[PDB]
Design a protein around this ligand. Sequence first.
Ligand SMILES: OC[C@H]1O[C@H](O[C@H]2[C@H](O)[C@@H](O)[C@@H](O[C@H]3[C@H](O)[C@@H](O)[C@@H](O)O[C@@H]3CO)O[C@@H]2CO)[C@H](O)[C@@H](O)[C@@H]1O
Ligand SMILES: OC[C@H]1O[C@H](O[C@H]2[C@H](O)[C@@H](O)[C@@H](O[C@H]3[C@H](O)[C@@H](O)[C@@H](O)O[C@@H]3CO)O[C@@H]2CO)[C@H](O)[C@@H](O)[C@@H]1O
Ligand SMILES: OC[C@H]1O[C@H](O[C@H]2[C@H](O)[C@@H](O)[C@@H](O[C@H]3[C@H](O)[C@@H](O)[C@@H](O)O[C@@H]3CO)O[C@@H]2CO)[C@H](O)[C@@H](O)[C@@H]1O
Ligand SMILES: [Ca+2]
Ligand SMILES: [Ca+2]
Ligand SMILES: [Ca+2]
Length: 642
Amino acid sequence: YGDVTVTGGISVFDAKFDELYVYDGDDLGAVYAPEETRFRLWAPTASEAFVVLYETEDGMPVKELPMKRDVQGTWTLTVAEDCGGLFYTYRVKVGEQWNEAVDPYAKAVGVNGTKTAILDLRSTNPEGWENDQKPPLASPTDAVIYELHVRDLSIHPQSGIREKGKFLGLTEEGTRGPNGIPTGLDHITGLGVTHVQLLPIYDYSQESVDESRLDEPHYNWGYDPQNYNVPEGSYSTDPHNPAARILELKRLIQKLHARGLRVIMDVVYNHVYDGYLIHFTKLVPGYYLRYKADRTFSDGTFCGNECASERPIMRKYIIESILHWVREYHIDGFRFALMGMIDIETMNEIRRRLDEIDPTILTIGEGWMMETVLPKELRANQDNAEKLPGIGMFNDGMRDAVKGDIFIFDRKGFISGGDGFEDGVKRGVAGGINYGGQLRQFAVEPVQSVNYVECHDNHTLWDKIELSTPGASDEERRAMHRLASAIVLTSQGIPFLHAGQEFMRTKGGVENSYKSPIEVNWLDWERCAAHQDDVSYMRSLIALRKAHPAFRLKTADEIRAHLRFEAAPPHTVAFTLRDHAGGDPDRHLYVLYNANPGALSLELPALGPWEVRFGGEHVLALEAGARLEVRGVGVVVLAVPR
Ligand SMILES: OC[C@H]1O[C@H](O[C@H]2[C@H](O)[C@@H](O)[C@@H](O[C@H]3[C@H](O)[C@@H](O)[C@@H](O)O[C@@H]3CO)O[C@@H]2CO)[C@H](O)[C@@H](O)[C@@H]1O
Ligand SMILES: OC[C@H]1O[C@H](O[C@H]2[C@H](O)[C@@H](O)[C@@H](O[C@H]3[C@H](O)[C@@H](O)[C@@H](O)O[C@@H]3CO)O[C@@H]2CO)[C@H](O)[C@@H](O)[C@@H]1O
Ligand SMILES: OC[C@H]1O[C@H](O[C@H]2[C@H](O)[C@@H](O)[C@@H](O[C@H]3[C@H](O)[C@@H](O)[C@@H](O)O[C@@H]3CO)O[C@@H]2CO)[C@H](O)[C@@H](O)[C@@H]1O
Ligand SMILES: [Ca+2]
Ligand SMILES: [Ca+2]
Ligand SMILES: [Ca+2]
């Protein structure tokens, strides 16, 4: 951990270390120009530091230059020759140990991320990149998220996409699949979703996907971070060419924006893929990651380590990393893996730094309550959401109430006939806010509640239903599935959909498919071709939400003012959104979630001449008390016209 004489007697573990070496510059890394390249490395506990230069990604050094000790724990060096096309690493001696690492501020790397690449990053911008414009977004509750893996999207043999498994595969328009159905980008833009959330597209570890063996089967979600500030090599057409993955990701984002879609990056700042080998511990051992009392890794992540976001240089790394994805790649939002492992101060400064640039940039995360050496009152989780204004959190209470518990596989939920889940559904209809009485969750405002019944984790909705409806036919399970999706899209808050949920995606019952083959993980376009009715259904639900601002209320005060739950029997939920809620064109809406297969009659509130808006196929009678008779599991939406 180092010669503790170099750092004023104070160890990397004492609390007086932090305020000592707080570098105030935003110039860490290397800045290339033809005249010179300047390097700055933060490594306060090292005795020596060298820049090592390479001509080829897997060559031997051509120069090995010593760096000068500089201010606030940093080392500098200027090289007064055109270093374009060169690769480099940092070699440091920490105590009596030498290690050679990639630059933590690497913005480009060679294959598998072991050497930093020097290049003019403005040569990676696609044509017109400076003219890139974002689709409008007035409120987070106006977003419809679609969670997608780059490999899943196109790797099925019948996807009809040329660059299968690649960033460029999501740039291709006009692709067709079995029976000529639209696939890929056209299928996604055809749905009406507004944001594509991509599973890890930063550079994840070689042990997960080896970028030199892409000619053999491979698959991994990528939750194993290696280089935080550069794209994953296996999604490029050429992982050996350091510029290719950058240019190709930018082409992807530019095209999505041009087609009306925004891009959310799944980011993992809570843990690295290997606390022993990552560059953080090579360069400053004992700083960037969290430690138990015995100076072993705190392991709240169940992955091996935790990043010490609360320490100032690590908070600065995370924030400069995010601002890099925003500024260099034009990213529109971030989903924070295990946000409950990150401290509140870091999350709020992130929200602030983004708001300074563009408040429509999204920040959502997993606010789970989880043990770690990070103090309980400092965790950015649902318990502390009052301290995290404007940050959305996955609403697991809503998820479990709708489809049934994710950990006990056979337990039913509201859609599958379970008893007593109506209040759980109502709590998420209200956007997870403090609505009143028993109707309360963690959110202060509905922008803090992300509604979902499916994501990449755990069984798919279809697979969950299959595990918990032993006496249900296939048609019955389809109706349950459809009802679950309708609840997400008609609840206050931020609706979130899993790619392929529109065609009842299955993983053959695999619960945790993170390294399962493409046969398990691909978007199955043959299944999608067999489920075009259900895709149309999902497309129409998304259109219904878009056509009604009353479903997207911006504040908890509006929800408390305009949302009212109505008389309804067990296994149903009924509510109204009254008096042009949020400027809705209709005067009132009435919404019915029916989980009963049979027929039933409801007395509608006396709000005016009701008219059908959605789900007419379930309506046996609508008569002006005013009466509605329906049959079958699903949603019915009525309106009192203006
Ligand atoms: O080899 C490292 C690591 O692999 C396995 O952990 C993986 C999980 O099993 C897998 O579900 C996935 O977990 C991530 C969630 O999907 C994601 O939503 C995110 O928020 O965080 C989770 C990771 O923290 O990926 C991990 C990492 O690959 C295995 O179970 C571990 O024991 C093993 O250390
Ligand atoms: O080995 C520990 C644990 O790992 C796995 O749990 C993961 C879940 O699959 C994943 O959904 C998420 O779980 C969170 C729930 O979604 C949320 O409702 C609430 O319960 O917090 C949970 C996290 O604490 O992340 C965990 C990560 O461990 C696996 O499925 C479990 O069986 C296993 O016990
Ligand atoms: O557009 C509003 C409309 O959306 C929903 O209707 C969809 C059906 O639920 C879905 O099964 C599908 O059904 C149609 C077939 O695609 C088509 O081949 C033909 O058979 O007509 C079917 C019935 O319309 O697509 C529709 C349209 O998206 C919702 O159920 C309706 O209540 C709603 O009015
Ligand atoms: Ca990689
Ligand atoms: Ca905000
Ligand atoms: Ca099955």
